[PDB]
């Protein structure tokens, strides 16, 4: 009933909710957890390039450095990875 | 061989594609066409509450003012979709 587009914000905030706690947010261990398990090929294609994407992303998108993501930033940290696929579709390296 | 979050960024961005010009960046006529297609149930829950979501739309994500949605404004409009969704997860009226 939903269409394509829609299924897949629905998705997201499912995955979201997967890695919260009681307070709606996600600490860094799920985080990272979350981020391994659901972005394995991103991260593959970083960890040739020598880049451990992982350590400091959580404090990079903590922004007002509660120790949680909220949605908010959890959107920008999809935001990054879909950006990286953009400009890989565009023929720029992988992890850029 | 992409997880399903994968596979929800790469349609994502197929998405931005299928509304471009030969720029890359997508027009007024069609990100409206874009959202009235993909976000056909989203829109309905706003009409509904007499918000007529798409006048203005487009000049509130092209920060720049260049009459051209890039990638970096579809994806801010892609979080404000999903923050309407995260918040009517939570109990919060449709189109809030
Ligand atoms: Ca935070
Ligand atoms: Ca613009
Ligand atoms: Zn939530
Ligand atoms: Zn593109």
């Known amino acids: 009933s939903n269409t394509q587009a829609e299924r897949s914000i629905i998705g997201m905030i499912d995955?979201?909710?997967?890695?919260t706690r009681r307070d709606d947010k996600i600490d860094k261990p799920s985080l990272l957890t979350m981020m391994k398990e659901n972005?394995?090929?991103?991260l593959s294609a970083?960890?040739?390039?020598?880049?451990?994407?992982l350590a400091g992303v959580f404090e990079?998108?903590?922004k007002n450095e509660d120790k949680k993501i909220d949605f908010s930033?959890?959107?920008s940290l999809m935001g990054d990875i879909a950006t990286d696929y953009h400009k890989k579709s565009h023929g720029a390296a992988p992890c850029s």
Request: hydrophobic fraction near 25%; include cysteine.
């Open 60 to 62: 990079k998108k903590d």
């Open 46 to 53: 970083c960890d040739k390039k020598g880049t451990n994407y």
């Open 39 to 42: 972005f394995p090929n991103f």
């Open 15 to 19: 995955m979201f909710h997967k890695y």
């Open 73 to 75: 930033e959890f959107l």
